[PDB]
């Protein structure tokens, strides 16, 4: 009952992270002895996804190299979607079931011949691979510890059920990286419905910064003609790049936050995590169970380090003139004890008086503590036209910034009288106080 | 008898002197799922020169309804023969190249030349229109 | 066991080493007026490079009948995503741009990659084909 495999399982090593050297044929125990397999250590399983070409994508070598870097003396298994994924995309959607059955048979054979503990295997799933793993494991008798996927496919999986798509019950623990969701429901490539016990929605899933418009023209540019095809795939690989970055930087994991909605997170009222919230993201994620879908949010840098901070702010606006204004740009800057940002902007419409506001700010440099603050208010009338005549202004009292990683209700504090924030004027300084 | 406001457009700096070729569309299709905030790209060819990839915007798209918008070009064209009506998307790759994406049908087009009043009636082909997202534009010609 | 003839094509002088992507067409239309000695122009786009305006010839065109021909390109393309099927004419001007010119309908396309045996099944869109003389080509995509 091991003749309908048609999907070769490879086993690379740190010295060779490019070419598949081994072939762990199910049933034929000879391969296990042929290629060293530490039955005591943990063993990952990478499941790549659809590829227009006839070869592995460019990210697998880096992923596997980083995996060995993080956890040496641990086996790695790769699959051979090729010969089946090259077919029409819906055909791959159908063949997900066959590959899942194949992987389940593989794991069952391993647990029968070698009784390898199932609690030491990850089904790293990308693109269609995540759904493939999800449909897999469920057939396994002893379940699976981790089924962490990457950018689960949306088409032909929304409006579905657990047997036909990744489900929380498919494994003991699960987490997904919703790195792309822009578009109408049920048609965006990236599924938006939460699937695992904990889900991550970096940047809100609308898009990612480390890219540009991309395709200049159908013929002049390269839609899938290499070149700018990768640029077109702005976010679909950002999941794997984020995962590998987190794996490499184990010392300082990025702390994704738990909230209620993307707009709520943007406002910044849902950052404090006294309970089991705001868990880590990546390999060092904390294993936790939830009574329901638990959305999360965070931000990131462009490409290389990621790992940004979060310093949401509140303002107790209280002035004299009561003419409400809307759609105004606020610019602030902060200085600390390690480094300092200079000209970070942000937006806050519907400004009023005798009212308190709040917003979310992010920086991409470590600052540690924070001493003083800048609160410049920008205008489109730089020249001396609007430098004398009375322009709208407000008064600033206290400021209640809250550090993200460490809960610090530091109370910033306007000076005795030297604030009077005004349009087209120098910022207002603040200091630690109280 | 009173204040008379006016409007126009212009090129970047040197020649200015742009044209105006506002357009109307008699959208009439079968599927009645309204969409909003969509980008329409069109292009035109004439008898002197031709623009290639001029975009424009038109939200609140519906069915059995007529719409209109303002277009400007910065090159002399004289008369105009054929038209392009591509509809752009942010899913270039073959993900959204097979499965049924929203589409409409196009009948006539009623562009109006600005400098010279010319109610030229553009005219879809017999059956070869079916404008669809992420698809080749629909050709049109002088007619009627 | 005997003489074994062979054939191929080539580029002009320097690299040679051209490909072979022979094609089949399942012509199936309504109007049954047979035509002969007509020029078909097609183009293809892939995942490495793309040709633009490669022509070819196919006389004795009919209906409810399948045809085939040999095509060659001189640039590596790897896989292939979409196709062009323009049908050329010697009446470019707007004389033959309105009145009903002969046309056909296109269903599936069965191109076969030479170096690697790949029976990729190209696939006309839902209704947006109606190939016609002196008209924009008909797009196709990977399917099935």
Numbering used by the authors:
A (entry chain A): 36 to 469
B (entry chain B), C (entry chain C): 326 to 469
Paper text:
LPL is a secreted lipase that is active in the blood, where it is the primary enzyme that hydrolyzes triglycerides from circulating lipoproteins such as chylomicrons. Before secretion, LPL is stored in sphingomyelin-rich vesicles, and insulin signals the trafficking of these secretory vesicles out of cells and into circulation. Earlier studies reported that at high concentrations, LPL was present in a “cryptic” or inactive storage form in secretory vesicles. The storage of high concentrations of LPL in an ordered but inactive form presents many potential biological advantages, including preventing lipase activity before secretion, avoiding the aggregation of concentrated LPL, and quick postprandial delivery of lipase to the bloodstream.
